[PDB]
Amino acid sequence: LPITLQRGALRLEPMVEADVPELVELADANREVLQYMSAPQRPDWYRQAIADQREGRALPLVVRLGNRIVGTTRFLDFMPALPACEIGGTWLEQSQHGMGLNASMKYLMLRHAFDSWQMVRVQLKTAASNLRSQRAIEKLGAVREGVLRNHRRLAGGRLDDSVLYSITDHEWPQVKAALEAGFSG
Amino acid sequence: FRPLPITLQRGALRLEPMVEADVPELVELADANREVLQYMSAPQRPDWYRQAIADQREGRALPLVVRLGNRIVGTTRFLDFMPALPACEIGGTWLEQSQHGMGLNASMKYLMLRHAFDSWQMVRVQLKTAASNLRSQRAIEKLGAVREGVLRNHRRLAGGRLDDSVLYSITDHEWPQVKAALEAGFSG
Numbered sequence: 001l002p003i004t005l006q007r008g009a010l011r012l013e014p015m016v017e018a019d020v021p022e023l024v025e026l027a028d029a030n031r032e033v034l035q036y037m038s039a040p041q042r043p044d045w046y047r048q049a050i051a052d053q054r055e056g057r058a059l060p061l062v063v064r065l066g067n068r069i070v071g072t073t074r075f076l077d078f079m080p081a082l083p084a085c086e087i088g089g090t091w092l093e094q095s096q097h098g099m100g101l102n103a104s105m106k107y108l109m110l111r112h113a114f115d116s117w118q119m120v121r122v123q124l125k126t127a128a129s130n131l132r133s134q135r136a137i138e139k140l141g142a143v144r145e146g147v148l149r150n151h152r153r154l155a156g157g158r159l160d161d162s163v164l165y166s167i168t169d170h171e172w173p174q175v176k177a178a179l180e181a182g183f184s185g
Numbered sequence: 186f187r188p189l190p191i192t193l194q195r196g197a198l199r200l201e202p203m204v205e206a207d208v209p210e211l212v213e214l215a216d217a218n219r220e221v222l223q224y225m226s227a228p229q230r231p232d233w234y235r236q237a238i239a240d241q242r243e244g245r246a247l248p249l250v251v252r253l254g255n256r257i258v259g260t261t262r263f264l265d266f267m268p269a270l271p272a273c274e275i276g277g278t279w280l281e282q283s284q285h286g287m288g289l290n291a292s293m294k295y296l297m298l299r300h301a302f303d304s305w306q307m308v309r310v311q312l313k314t315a316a317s318n319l320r321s322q323r324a325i326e327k328l329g330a331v332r333e334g335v336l337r338n339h340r341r342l343a344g345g346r347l348d349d350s351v352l353y354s355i356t357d358h359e360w361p362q363v364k365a366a367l368e369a370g371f372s373g
């Protein structure tokens with residue numbers, strides 16, 4: 001079920017139709033940085049996420065920094081029998097790269113999934129050509145499970161592999177510690 | 186790619202669209218084959234079939250019944266469609282014990298992979314199975330599918346126990362060799 005997460009200036013809130021135009025304008029202003037994503041420039045990428053929420057398939061979130069939209073992220077691919085899910089669909093405007101915002105986002109969402117949803121597995125995947133995203137994920141301590149061939153298209157249509165990672169509930173203390181270590185340097 | 190229902194045929198072997206009327210016989214046969222189905226989640230649960238039939242309405246799965254001489258002998262399905270690529274999974278496969286090692290699996294996979302790669306023009310077909318299920322692993326390896334890795338805490342076994350998944354796939358560039366190896370095992 002839907003949730004709103006916050007930590008200081010950062011707020012993760014359910015995505016609504018009213019957010020779509022500002023997200024698309026921001027993505028297009030940041031198009032260079034978003035080349036590894038599928039279609040961040042398309043309104044229907046955001047609306048399909050809102051529709052997926054209706055069908056219980058996704059929880060799309062808008063990232064606000066001091067009340068300003070700076071990007072998006074989402075829970076998806078729920079496996080209720082386990083329970084397990086994915087954090088995916090993440091992007092931030094360039095000026096937030098390196099600022100610790102991703103780490104705060106991942107901490108809030110991962111804490112929710114493990115502590116509140118009692119997940120046994122949270123997975124994350126990224127393009128094999130997207131080295132900065134791989135490093136961000138590796139910094140979490142997520143375990144690299146393998147390379148999935150022909151598993152995504154990049155923004156300009158090119159086929160790429162995906163790298164798949166996960167974190168188990170057993171591993172959560174480890175990951176929580178590493179994120180909290182970053183908060184405080 | 187359009188996820189439309191199809192019948193696939195080879196000799197006396199037919200893969201036919203699964204329908205509601207089939208579910209009781211499937212569940213009855215799975216119950217008679219409990220011992221061989223212990224690594225799957227829910228082959229003995231009618232809802233596992235019903236759910237795929239429902240998902241087909243929305244384009245998200247194509248469940249199939251395996252008939253040999255018009256006799257139900259097991260099941261398999263296409264699922265996890267990725268339309269942008271396009272890509273899919275072959276999963277939910279089981280046969281009654283009496284058909285293990287009798288060549289039906291290779292025929293079924295040839296038919297499904299041919300549809301996926303030649304008609305749907307897929308770039309990726311994936312297959313996955315429990316880390317505990319070594320017979321399935323060896324049968325997927327015999328196809329030539331490439332082992333991509335182990336997914337932790339990713340499934341439950343029939344009785345409820347958490348296990349890992351081994352994930353494999355076949356790409357469009359690998360299909361020609363997969364197809365030819367399968368045909369090297371067939372007559373004509």
Ligand SMILES: CC(C)(COP(=O)(O)OP(=O)(O)OC[C@H]1O[C@@H](n2cnc3c(N)ncnc32)[C@H](O)[C@@H]1OP(=O)(O)O)[C@@H](O)C(=O)NCCC(=O)NCCS
Nearest residue numbers: 088089090091092097098099102125126131132133135136
């Ligand atoms: C950048 C983004 C992933 C969010 O994270 P972020 O704040 O940049 O993350 P980080 O700050 O930890 O930076 C990532 C790292 O990449 C490093 N980096 C990695 N590969 C590099 C390379 N080839 N060249 C130069 N620098 C590289 C950077 O030094 C940095 O790591 P560091 O802290 O060790 O110095 C994301 O918004 C993005 O902009 N677009 C695509 C999103 C995506 O990939 N989604 C996949 C599914 S969610």
Ligand SMILES: CC(C)(COP(=O)(O)OP(=O)(O)OC[C@H]1O[C@@H](n2cnc3c(N)ncnc32)[C@H](O)[C@@H]1OP(=O)(O)O)[C@@H](O)C(=O)NCCC(=O)NCCS
Nearest residue numbers: 221278279280284285286287290313314319320321323324
């Ligand atoms: C998965 C399945 C369709 C494979 O069909 P099959 O006809 O049994 O496949 P094969 O006999 O060609 O291959 C299995 C291989 O593993 C061998 N094998 C059998 N038991 C084994 C075991 N515990 N450990 C390792 N290998 C084993 C078989 O001898 C054979 O190898 P070989 O032909 O080289 O000698 C069938 O076994 C089945 O329905 N199993 C129960 C349902 C199931 O588990 N499905 C998994 C869904 S992912």
